[PDB]
Amino acid sequence: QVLVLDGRGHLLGRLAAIVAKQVLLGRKVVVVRCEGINISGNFYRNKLKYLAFLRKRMNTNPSRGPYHFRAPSRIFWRTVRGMLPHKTKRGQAALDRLKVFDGIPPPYDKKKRMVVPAALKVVRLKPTRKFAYLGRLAHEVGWKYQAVTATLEEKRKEKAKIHYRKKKQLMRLRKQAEKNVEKKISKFTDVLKTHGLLV
Amino acid sequence: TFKTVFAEHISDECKRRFYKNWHKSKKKAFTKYCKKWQDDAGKRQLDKDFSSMKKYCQVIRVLAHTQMRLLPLRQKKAHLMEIQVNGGTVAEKLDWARERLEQQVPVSQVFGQDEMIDVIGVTKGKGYKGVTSRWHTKKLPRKTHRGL
Amino acid sequence: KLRASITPGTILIILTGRHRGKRVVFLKQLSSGLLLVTGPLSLNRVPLRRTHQKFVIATSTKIDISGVKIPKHLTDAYFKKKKLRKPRHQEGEIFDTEKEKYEITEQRKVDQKAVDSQILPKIKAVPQLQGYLRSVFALTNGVYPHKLVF
Amino acid sequence: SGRLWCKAIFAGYKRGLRNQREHTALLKIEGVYARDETEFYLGKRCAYVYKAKNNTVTPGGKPNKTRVIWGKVTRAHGNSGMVRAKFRSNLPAKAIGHRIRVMLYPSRI
Amino acid sequence: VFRRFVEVGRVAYVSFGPHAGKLVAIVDVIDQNRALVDGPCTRVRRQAMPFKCMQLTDFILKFPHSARQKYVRKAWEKADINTKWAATRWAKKIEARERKAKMTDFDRYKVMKAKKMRNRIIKNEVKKLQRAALLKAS
RNA sequence: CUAAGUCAGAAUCCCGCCCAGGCGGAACGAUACGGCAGCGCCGCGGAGCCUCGGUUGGCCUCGGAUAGCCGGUCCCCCGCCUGUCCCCGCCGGCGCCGCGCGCCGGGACCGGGGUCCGGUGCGGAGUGCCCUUCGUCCUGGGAAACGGGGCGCGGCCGGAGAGGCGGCCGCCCCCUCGCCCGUCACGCACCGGCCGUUCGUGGGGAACCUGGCGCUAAACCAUUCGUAGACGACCUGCUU
RNA sequence: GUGGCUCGGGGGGCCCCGCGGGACCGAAACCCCCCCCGAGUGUUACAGCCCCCCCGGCAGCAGCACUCGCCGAAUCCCGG
């Protein structure tokens, strides 16, 4: 259908190198919560490796200089553009399938979001190596919405818990409903675990 | 911008603003909007608008236009401006604006004396000027066989 | 030739006919190397019918068979479209709306009814089976025709 | 009834790095994600279905807008489970990410 | 915190390689990664195989330091690993994925109807359990 | 003073104020008879070009990895609508209530953090996953009779981050069939063995044809001003 | 096995009568128990853990579907 990748605990490059292939293959990928995307290495080191990109602009022009997009949505969407062709016409008709957001907008709020274990930090980084949150790195170099997004996330995480509190309470009823009507689903549940289900 | 609410009576000074020809046009502006404050049904819709603005809107501003039937200009076109309100909780901030609506606001209620205020406005205009009058760069010597 | 997994009285999935995916009951191979196929009328509305070896998926679900009688007659120009196609008299005047007809038989009718007489009781022996033949095969999300075994 | 054809994704041509040999495609069948489970699909007639402007006849029915370019699946590719395919008329390079049906019916079971 | 150790006499489960699906007993440790193991009753040979390939299991045998197969078999079958393993909740999960992968097509149809009826039953009996739960909340 | 962790720190560096406002979104105002009309909203037809993809769905906890999950809790305080409902409390119509209150407080609270133990954990409360089942017709069993359907009505929500809608309810009409097993009967369902939309399609755009509810202009030029000006642009004035 | 030690676990005073003539028939420890159980030390050191080596003497399954480590095909062919 439409992937909705959760970008909390992922590494920048290894996640982009996976989305870049999917987009060129035609699937519409949408990423959320990029502001939690980790990176390898120090933090003082990577801030130097971004304040080494703000310099690379022939300053008083935007023509003879590049664009230093700062919001973490654009930082990741830029480091994907590197991994695709974009001078072609399948390059620009692919890049506009990937859609990158900060936090979680309401359309993708009520959607199950799939992690990508190939790039996950707890898998691809040793337990002792250090790492740098994209949020603090981006908020340091001029992002102006470290707080506005943060309060909104507090609003959502509670509004999700209300749903889950409801979701847990239901499954107890279905779990209990089996014990009530076990006397007359006997010959079905038998054939389900003959075939390997429910064991 | 979240929502906008306009007063029931709009001074015909202000209606001048949204137009480009007061001699040509039939001046039908906001006429269909003066009704929502006239019948009951709109009030039930309108008061909902203000209540929503209480719960959601963080910073509230008010659209205040100037007098022109007093200034000795050639102008009859009022200037509309957003003015922010800085104060307590949003609900009382809104209940303040819904109260001040449609009324006059003197200068004293806004400022004081011996305060510091900041003057913002479009500079004068001297037109297409060379580089010596623009950036105050040095003039070359007198003997240059081209523009000096 | 026949593949190693097709035996008389096995269930198939037909893949390229008018009905693209019914289950059927295979009887035997003709002299002309095409499977004799019948998913009996009262379960699929499929009559005695030839089908090719290659176009048919074999399934691991068989029923014992002893109604293999009634040798073949099948051919074409027998149900061939003789309303639109060339053969109506092998002639080339204006047709294709002038005379509409498809040949329809009586011997096939008794032939079909005299075959499932031996078959249908054997089908009913396994419970829920006639339900399985009525429904039609169709892939779905999470169905990988390389990973599921028939 | 649902689809009787497996899904697949056209993914390019067989290309060295610059000499793009434009007569042998590279499918990626949805689901097969490693070689040695690709011995089931190879040899089955595939198809590329697309619409157009002018009508064309349809075997078995009335003319419609649909046109198809038939093909076949020849041999395995790489290790991730892609399969080369030899189309009767080389694919138009417009569909570089779009659908390519892999029918089932040339069968080996 | 850790509650399953690797020591002389453990019984590990092989997951990757030619010997997947068979339990194996750990005899001796040679280095970080390889471990000299053996299965007498699981038809496995005495050979090293890397620690990456084993999933640990709760059970423990008794070995001195390292022994022949004559004395690994005895302590293996005096504790009935071949049956204790089959009684665990773990094994029943492996045989569940090993039946689901055996489903013949007509069989799968049986489940389609069976799982169809079994879900209507719960759907109604939840609603009757849904009404009372709200009713007793008031 | 460093390996893990933590502090002070500067004309630097980053942001703020300040200057422009993206093939970037916003909110609101008005919407062309003084017509032989052009029109916007709800109902429903019939053609005539086109642009393309697709070919069940998955409506959501947070979060860790040298740990997590699910449950019942008599135990414990509370973030709770001044922490909500009954009530001793002053007075009236003080056993009862608030035409006023304050819940000091006993007690009632669906919840959640906490306690405690009881279960799983190469995770079955499993994305190795879950939900929906796509040939037509008698009767005769099983769950069912708190079931279904009608772009139904009236209210509640609930939603603003790119709610742009989804859900809950009260009432209206008729059915007892819709699901699982049976028996019986079927238009030989046309291809005779054989190809391309089986569906999300009431998809998007545009031009001509069917009612009711209802709408009646703004921009630019010509003119004027000089708060602007090389010509454009800009700031302004013109039947009360 | 024994040896000195350290750590936890089983509990250990008691009946009977329809609040009474007196104590939750409850473990309660400021603590006590063993010839009790499960582990870390050093110890001589058995064959109720073994391992290796040396005398004499058993058919065992063949380069193994017990998938521990070779090279091959007048010692080589069959089926798809």
From TrEMBL, chain A:
The keyword Transport does not apply. The keyword Ribonucleoprotein applies. GO terms for molecular function: mRNA binding; structural constituent of ribosome. One of its GO terms (biological process) is negative regulation of translation. SUPFAM superfamilies: Ribosomal protein L13. It holds the Pfam family Ribosomal_L13. Keywords: Citrullination, Ribonucleoprotein, Ribosomal protein, Translation regulation. NCBIfam families: L13_A_E. This is Large ribosomal subunit protein uL13. It comes from Heterocephalus glaber (Naked mole rat).
